[PDB]
Design a protein around this ligand. Structure first.
Ligand SMILES: [Zn+2]
Ligand SMILES: [Zn+2]
Ligand SMILES: [Zn+2]
Ligand SMILES: [Zn+2]
Ligand SMILES: [Zn+2]
Lengths: 55, 199, 518, 199, 199, 100, 219
């Protein structure tokens, strides 16, 4: 994806902070928000598809 | 809330009442007969808007007293949501607790609506420059509305009655500056439960 | 490919059916056409004269058209004509063809694209160009994979004083053309109407309300006629206001008080009768068939467009303008489909055959795609033979072709505001709630139609009505004074006008930050 | 499961009604002609949502009575599944027994729907500030809706009748605080079999 | 087996109709524009399931009549095969004689499919707490299906027509509790020979 | 009789699908499952090669194709799946065509 | 029509006297198959050429740029059965996500790499009872043996997947029992299936194989 963006940006012109949270906490927090239904299966699935397209 | 407020409002006409007809088909059917038809219920009764005469009345009186109220009569003027006029009649995101009925006439078209003739007169020749044929509501006609307040507060009947007294002072409907629309009010108010129908 | 029902031309693109016109020239004959039309994915109304439109609500009534593509002004003129013609059908109480419900359902599926804007529908690229007949006159260019087709439309004339005189034409390759051969004495009118009202008598100018009365009005306005002018026409006043609304789709000279204020719009029938009893110019009637009373006192200079015929005010083209329209296309067409009486088509077809272009009076040309890059170095990733390639999609008129970096290197061998200032102004007018998400969305729908549609839309949203000082924006949220609110409205006008200049990708990137859905 | 409850509901409009157009194409094709279109069919008959009005009415009265009902009308609020509005109108696990039809007008839009001029008037200058146009159902129009309860309990008919009396008191459709949407109801219940279509 | 019963049904749509997109690709393509897509074809016609609706109608009605009909609607329910709905609509061991086609539309999308704005309103505030957008099928939309019964008996046509009248009472697909899916059926039945194609 | 090979590929014609099983008293989805399915308008190509032909073979194959148009091809024929149309291009060839 | 002056119509010609011959034909040629002479022929309003189905599946934005018009696109060429197609990044992202889901589908947990006790007689009795009421079916026993031959951990994982009462629906993945049962007996039979399968998880492979042939002979 870096090289693809490099070439596409390069070619197009030719013509013309994340919070640091520990893994165990992450597990506990998504456990808690899944129990109280804020982070649901549809939410995790959509966030997974948007993570597959990049950060 | 657990309780609601019912304000049964009876209006008697002391001076001829004109409120203008709104429906395009009724206006266009009326054009040959009259030039200014009265707003008419399709079951042959006369309907006068109420919310707007209560809201406008309360906005002028509350703005004259100095309470932090907004103006809903200016062009596309968004209601603020923090004044007692916004709480009573509605904001742009919270509805009004006072559902205000239309002023349904207790009689029909044939009994209280009369078809009449007004003039524009020259100031020098003292003759009719223009004639125009409208129709207003006879005096002594009785109209009935019901204001239902969903979550009532302490100063809810007092503001409605003050708005009603301002309406008797200035008029409701149209041609108020010419003499039309001078009314009387009788209020019968009551506290009902919201669960009064559950049997 | 092209079936000729009538005006009615159907183009079967193999993938979809594109009807162009569905006009009105018994009932069973009209039904034969509607039954033959079949299911059409699109009807493209070239213009609105009820001869290229009219039998379109029927196509909505019998469910034969999915979507109707036109010019915006063609849409509103079609609205006026459909309502008026349904009113007439009830005057002679003729079992009406369609209903008002069919009229209201016709604009349910309508779509508007202005000009020079390519809409891709069902593998066909459709583009609109002007032909100077009426306000939204359009010559339609559909490029399909079996050829490029151009439906001229009623190409206008050099006489037009309201439109351009060179009807615009596709800058690409036109394979088939479907031209139409219906086939300055104005000053004389400006003489004699100046004579007659000097004689103290009135003048009568019977003219059609759609695209004829306004050219008779324009001439009487750019010129000076100290005597008074009136319009006693019922659709005529409304289409004159349609000219004053959709003046942006007119001549570039008239982009910016059209018709001055000379015309007095005769609003009522009482005014019509009292005007016919007056002593003191009255434009009215349809082919001299309100008009009856005017006829009596104009009989008691009656010009036709004192019996008088003036031919200068004509809208249809002349053999020479049609010939010049084909002789101005970049490539000579393969065949001119000379449609729409026999004698005119015969004399024009002789001159065309004398100009060495083919005519049929009612060749497998496939727009292939060329790879032009090596495929030997392919691989199997997940059950597919794939190769990442870096190249360019060249769009030669003969064939689409795909090329590498070698080809690109070898071939190499409106108010204006900055992007940051536009971003800042849209943000500030969005926080004070002049520009809203509904406003940005409506702007994006008008900007998808074209630049001139958005220019009209913001001209409508920023025009301060002279009667009541209402500008039609959304009022600011704050404690601003009157001149500050007017400066904010000017800022919104110039900001959206300056954004009209940009391309659609830049406008989408700017606006999808305020309305995340437009 | 053996019998089923029919409530045939005939509603007569007693003050002008406005349910808004919901279809984007129907609202967009009418915006040059009416600013507020009324919800209509493709057969040009007026459509009113009814299940939500009955559910909201019963939640309001049963919450003001003190019985345990969920407040479903909050944003993304899951119904509890144990209340009687969850029994009558559904939960996320079990559908409603009371399948509530739309309120379909007996007449066509040409007979019962009219255009209208709604105003906003300035309060100091007493003059027309904003003018807009709505479609309104006339008074005297008749709407029909059939409520079918699949597993009828004893109190469901009384709950529907109390909700109908609440809708008569409050209003249905939109613009409810301005006097719009005041209706009258004529319920005609009937306990039919479930197997009555079997010949 | 020499004869076969063809039942041509035409469903006219009388209320709105929501059926749901089953295709994950078509949903994900359409859930950037509308939250409840309509089940459509790739040839842009509306698809409605028909076999499950007729089956469910027959099991509800024949369980109410007291006939021996197994409930296939329960989770992981295995049909017995010794039923009457098991002969028409299949079992674990014998296919159904009544092959029931989809209800495909005569018209297309953008002629019968419209795109609508639905709402959810706070009960104590009367404000739009949530909004979604659905896709609905207009009224007067005609759908055609054919039910071919391979080994016909006398009870098949009557049972299918009965089940159809149950669908005209209840609804065909989607949100049958808020009014959607109320439709009407016209039936044309013929008894063809199985060797009608063999020439 | 050859297989009915599609003209297109899974990413153009095969669409995942959600099927349901609804309880008759609760009207709730008691069960669901996900099955792939071929879209409407997908085109499939087969070739039937008849050796030593008789007169009736074209009529027999065309009648059987009309029966498949009526009743369906593949699975789930009862719930509405498999309804197709057939277009027939027949041609008599000589068995020695390939010999040069 | 291909001509290599014939008075009849000539759609295609294969070639200043050239210009004179070309203008001398009746009608005009649609395309002529001819450098500077080709561009001169272009100047007489006549087209020139100057000498698997390819499908460009792509979005469109066109920059006119030079005399030739272009559209910048680094992408992918996909070779297929009878067609060649051109796709963008999003196609390759989609096939990458599908392939990557197919990858983790594989090598899950520890394939082919804390349990109750009950007698062997008890295990035959419980599997024999749940065979005949359609809970421990033949598909269930098959996938038992498939998850068992990859290890005890996979079998515990599959059993906890089937027995898991989902809090949203209240439905375990067992086959519902056949016969007249109330709810409490149904959960007790499901717990019996839980305990029986988790207790045969502790046994060795030839003491499982010999207990599931007399229910599944095609294990
Ligand atoms: Zn306020
Ligand atoms: Zn024209
Ligand atoms: Zn013409
Ligand atoms: Zn509840
Ligand atoms: Zn059974």
């Amino acid at each position: 994806d870096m090289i693809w963006n490099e070439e596409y940006n390069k070619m197009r012109s030719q013509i013309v902070a994340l919070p640091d949270m520990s893994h165990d906490k992450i597990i506990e927090n998504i456990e808690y928000l899944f129990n109280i239904k804020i982070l649901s299966k549809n939410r995790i699935k959509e966030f997974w598809e948007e993570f597959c397209k990049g950060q | 809330a657990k309780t609601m407020k019912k304000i049964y409002v009876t209006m008697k006409t002391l001076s001829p009442l004109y409120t203008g007809e709104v429906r395009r088909e009724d206006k266009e059917a009326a054009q040959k007969r009259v030039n200014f038809p009265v707003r008419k219920t399709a079951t042959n009764k006369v309907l006068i808007p109420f919310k707007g005469a209560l809201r406008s009345a309360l906005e002028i009186m509350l703005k004259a007293k100095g309470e932090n109220v907004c103006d809903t009569g200016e062009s596309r003027a968004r209601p603020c949501g923090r004044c007692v006029t916004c709480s009573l009649f509605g904001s742009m995101g919270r509805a009004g607790r006072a559902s205000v009925d239309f002023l349904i006439s207790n009689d029909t078209k044939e009994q209280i609506v009369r078809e009449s003739t007004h003039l524009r007169i020259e100031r020098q020749t003292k003759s009719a420059s223009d004639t125009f044929k409208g129709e207003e509501v006879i005096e002594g006609a009785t109209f009935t509305a019901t204001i239902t307040i969903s979550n009532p507060q302490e100063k809810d009947l007092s503001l409605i009655q003050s708005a009603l007294k301002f309406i008797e002072e200035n008029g409701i409907g149209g041609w108020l500056n010419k003499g039309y629309g001078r009314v009387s009010f009788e209020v019968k108010s009551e506290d009902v439960a919201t669960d009064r129908f559950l049997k | 490919m092209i079936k000729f029902i009538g005006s009615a031309f159907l183009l079967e693109t193999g993938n979809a059916k594109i009807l162009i016109d569905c006009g009105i020239e018994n009932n069973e004959i009209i039904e034969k056409k509607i039954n033959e039309i079949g299911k059409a994915d699109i009807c493209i109304l070239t213009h609105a004269h009820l001869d290229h439109s009219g039998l379109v609500p029927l196509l909505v009534k019998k469910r034969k058209v999915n979507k109707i593509i036109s010019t915006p002004a063609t849409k509103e003129l079609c609205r006026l004509l459909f309502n008026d013609f349904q009113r007439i059908q009830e005057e002679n109480n003729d079992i009406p063809l369609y209903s008002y419900d069919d009229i209201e359902s016709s604009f349910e599926i309508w779509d508007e694209i202005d000009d020079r804007n390519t809409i891709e529908l069902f593998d066909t690229k459709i583009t609109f160009y002007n032909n100077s007949h009426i306000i939204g006159s359009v010559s339609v260019f559909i490029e399909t994979h079996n050829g490029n087709y151009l439906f001229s439309g009623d190409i206008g004339s050099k006489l037009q004083q309201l439109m351009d005189y060179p009807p615009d034409m596709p800058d690409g390759n036109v394979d088939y053309l479907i031209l139409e051969s219906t086939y300055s004495d104005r000053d004389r009118l400006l003489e004699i109407a100046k004579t007659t009202c000097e004689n103290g008598g009135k003048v009568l100018i019977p003219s059609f309300a759609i695209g004829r009365l306004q050219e008779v009005l324009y001439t009487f306005s750019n010129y000076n006629f100290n005597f008074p002018v009136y319009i006693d026409s019922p659709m005529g006043s409304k289409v004159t206001n349609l000219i004053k609304e959709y003046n942006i789709y007119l001549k570039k000279k008239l982009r910016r008080d059209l018709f001055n204020n000379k015309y007095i719009a005769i609003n009522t029938s009482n005014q019509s009768k009292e005007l016919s009893n007056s002593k003191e110019v009255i434009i009215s009637a349809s082919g001299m068939l309100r008009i009856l009373n005017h006829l009596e006192q104009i009989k008691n200079t009656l010009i036709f467009v004192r019996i008088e015929k003036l031919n200068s005010f004509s809208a249809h083209a002349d053999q020479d303008e049609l010939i010049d329209y084909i002789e101005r296309l970049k490539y000579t067409p393969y065949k001119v489909f000379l449609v729409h009486e026999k004698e005119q088509r015969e004399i024009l077809a002789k001159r065309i055959i004398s100009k060495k272009i083919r005519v049929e009076l009612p060749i497998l040309i496939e727009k292939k795609v060329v790879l032009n890059i090596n495929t030997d170095n392919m691989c199997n990733f997940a059950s597919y033979r794939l190769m990442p390639f870096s190249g360019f999609i060249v769009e030669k008129d003969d064939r689409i072709e795909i090329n590498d970096k070698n080809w690109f290197d070898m071939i190499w061998n409106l108010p204006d505001m900055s992007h940051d200032k536009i971003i800042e102004n849209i943000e500030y007018l969005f926080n004070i709630k002049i520009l809203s998400k509904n406003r940005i969305k409506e702007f994006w729908e008008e900007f998808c139609k074209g630049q001139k549609a958005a220019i009209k839309y913001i001209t409508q949203v920023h025009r301060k009505n002279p009667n009541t000082g209402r500008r039609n924006w959304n009022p600011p949220e704050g404690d601003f004074t009157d001149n500050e609110i007017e400066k904010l409205y000017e800022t919104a006008y110039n900001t959206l006008l300056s954004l009209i200049k940009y391309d659609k990708n830049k406008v989408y990137n700017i606006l999808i930050n305020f309305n995340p859905k437009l």
